[PDB]
C-alpha cells in the first residue's frame, strides 16, 4: 500500500555526485595508469560487476587504493565513472572503442550493449 | 551530446538497499530510543537536510553512532529510512502523524508535503 516519489532515485544520485565533486566521504582511489579517481565504494559496487566482486572480497574491501589493468584507458574510465554518478554517457566516435573495452572490464552490461549497437550501426 | 540510461538511478538505489540489507559498508548506527538502525552516511546525507548538516560537520562526520532526539518515534524513523533507500513510503492512518513529525525533524521536505496534503484531505 506504499506511495512512491518518482524523482527520489535521481535526487539521491545527484547528491551522491555532489559528494564526489566535493570529495566528501570518498573511501577509495582508483588508479588507472598515471591517473587517480576518488569515489565511493558503495556507488562503484552498485554500478559495476567488477567492483561488486572486489569490494565483497574479505581482504580487498579494506583497501584504500585499487589499481586497474594497465590496458585500461583513463579517459574511458573517467567517462564510465561520470556515467555511474549521473546516468549520462558521453559516447563519441573518438572514444567508443575505449568506453566499450572499459565497460566490458568493469562488467557494466547496459553500457556494453549500447556501445555494440552504436558500432553495428556505423558498419 | 550525452545519451542517458533511464533506469540507472533506480538500479543504483536498489543495489544501495541490497548493501543495507546485507550490512555491507554501513558506516553509522542511528539510535532512536531503544532501537538501532545501520545505514550509509552518504545515503542519509543525500536524503535528509539534518544528516547532510551532521555529516558535513568536521567533528560529527567521524562518529560511528548518532543519537536522535528522544521525541523521535522508532517506527516513523524506520519508515523514512526505508523510503530513503527505495523511494517508497509506507504512509498509513496509524503512522502518518509520527512519519510527518520525523520527516520535519529529518528535513525531508517532499515527505512533509505529502503528509500535509494527506492530513488536509481527511479534515
Amino acid at each position: 500500500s506504499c506511495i512512491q516519489f518518482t524523482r527520489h532515485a535521481s535526487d539521491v544520485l545527484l547528491n551522491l555526485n555532489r559528494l564526489r565533486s566535493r570529495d566528501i566521504l570518498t573511501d577509495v582511489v582508483i588508479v588507472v595508469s598515471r591517473e587517480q579517481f576518488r569515489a565511493h565504494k558503495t556507488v562503484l559496487m552498485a554500478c559495476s560487476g567488477l567492483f561488486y566482486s572486489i569490494f565483497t572480497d574479505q581482504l580487498k574491501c579494506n583497501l584504500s587504493v585499487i589499481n586497474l589493468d594497465p590496458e585500461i584507458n583513463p579517459e574511458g574510465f573517467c567517462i564510465l565513472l561520470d556515467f555511474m554518478y549521473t546516468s549520462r554517457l558521453n559516447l563519441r566516435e573518438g572514444n567508443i572503442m575505449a568506453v566499450m573495452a572499459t565497460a566490458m572490464y568493469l562488467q557494466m552490461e547496459h553500457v556494453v550493449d549500447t556501445c555494440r549497437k552504436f558500432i553495428k550501426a556505423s558498419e | 551530446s550525452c545519451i542517458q540510461f533511464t533506469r540507472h538511478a533506480s538500479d543504483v538505489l536498489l543495489n544501495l538497499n541490497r548493501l543495507r540489507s546485507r550490512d555491507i559498508l554501513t558506516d553509522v548506527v542511528i539510535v532512536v530510543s531503544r532501537e538501532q538502525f545501520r545505514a550509509h552516511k552518504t545515503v542519509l546525507m543525500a536524503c535528509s537536510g539534518l544528516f547532510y548538516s551532521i555529516f558535513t560537520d568536521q567533528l560529527k562526520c567521524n562518529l560511528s553512532v548518532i543519537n536522535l532526539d528522544p521525541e523521535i518515534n522508532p517506527e516513523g524513523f524506520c519508515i523514512l529510512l526505508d523510503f530513503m533507500y527505495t523511494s517508497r513510503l509506507n504512509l498509513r492512518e496509524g503512522n502518518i502523524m509520527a512519519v510527518m513529525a520525523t520527516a520535519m525533524y529529518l528535513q525531508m521536505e517532499h515527505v512533509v508535503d505529502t503528509c500535509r496534503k494527506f492530513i488536509k484531505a481527511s479534515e
Binding site: 506504499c2 506511495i3 512512491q4 518518482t6 | 513510503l89
Partner: peptide
C-alpha cells in the same frame, strides 16, 4: 507522488 504516485501509486507504484
Amino acid at each position: 507522488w504516485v501509486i507504484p
